[PDB]
Amino acid sequence: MVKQIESKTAFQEALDAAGDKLVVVDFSATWCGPCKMIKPFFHSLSEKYSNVIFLEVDVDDCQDVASECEVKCMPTFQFFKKGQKVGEFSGANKEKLEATINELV
């Protein structure tokens, strides 16, 4: 249920099409083990929370997006509502990810 993002215009259109809904963005890289390990849990949240929009952005695919979003640690989870960033943290922490979704939804 994760939208796979493959350009900066695809990214901004996803943020623009989301309406009032929370958008959760997973910034990952293929060399990041924990990124790869949390991916099924990320997928699970998108099936569980059909009311929230989930995006995946690979930093090496999407360098322009990575650099504009000021990403540092892999994975980084950024949260948006109506185009605006409303949350951010890094690291593959499952419990923290879900809790953040429940705080912002």
Curated annotation (Swiss-Prot):
Modification(s) after translation: In the fully reduced protein, both Cys-69 and Cys-73 are nitrosylated in response to nitric oxide (NO). When two disulfide bonds are present in the protein, only Cys-73 is nitrosylated. Cys-73 can serve as donor for nitrosylation of target proteins. In case of infection, ubiquitinated by S.typhimurium protein slrP, leading to its degradation.
Gene Ontology molecular-function annotations: protein homodimerization activity; protein-disulfide reductase [NAD(P)H] activity; protein-disulfide reductase activity; RNA binding; thioredoxin-disulfide reductase (NADPH) activity
N6-acetyllysine modifications at: 3, 39, 94
Domain Thioredoxin: 2-105
Superkingdom of this protein's organism: Eukaryota
Protein name: Thioredoxin
Site (Contributes to redox potential value): 33-34
Modified residues (S-nitrosocysteine): 62, 69, 73
Residues modified as N6-succinyllysine: 8, 94
Function: Participates in various redox reactions through the reversible oxidation of its active center dithiol to a disulfide and catalyzes dithiol-disulfide exchange reactions. Plays a role in the reversible S-nitrosylation of cysteine residues in target proteins, and thereby contributes to the response to intracellular nitric oxide. Nitrosylates the active site Cys of CASP3 in response to nitric oxide (NO), and thereby inhibits caspase-3 activity. ADF augments the expression of the interleukin-2 receptor TAC (IL2R/P55).
Lineage of the organism: Eukaryota, Metazoa, Chordata, Craniata, Vertebrata
Induction / repression: Up-regulated by ionizing radiation.
Transmembrane regions listed in the UniProt entry: none
Residue pairs linked by disulfide bridges in the UniProt entry: 32-35
Entry-linked InterPro entries: Thioredoxin, Thioredoxin-like_sf, Thioredoxin_CS, Thioredoxin_domain
Record note on what altering residue 35 to S does: Loses its reducing activity, interaction with APEX1 and transcription activation
Single GO biological process annotation from the record: positive regulation of DNA binding
Protein encoded by which gene: TXN
Site feature location: Deprotonates C-terminal active site Cys: 26
Localization of this protein: Nucleus; Cytoplasm; Secreted
GO cellular component: cytoplasm; cytosol; extracellular exosome; extracellular region; nucleoplasm; nucleus
Impact upon substituting residue 62 to S: Retains its reducing activity. Retains interaction with APEX1 and transcription activation
Catalytic site: 32, 35
Family the UniProt entry places it in: Belongs to the thioredoxin family.
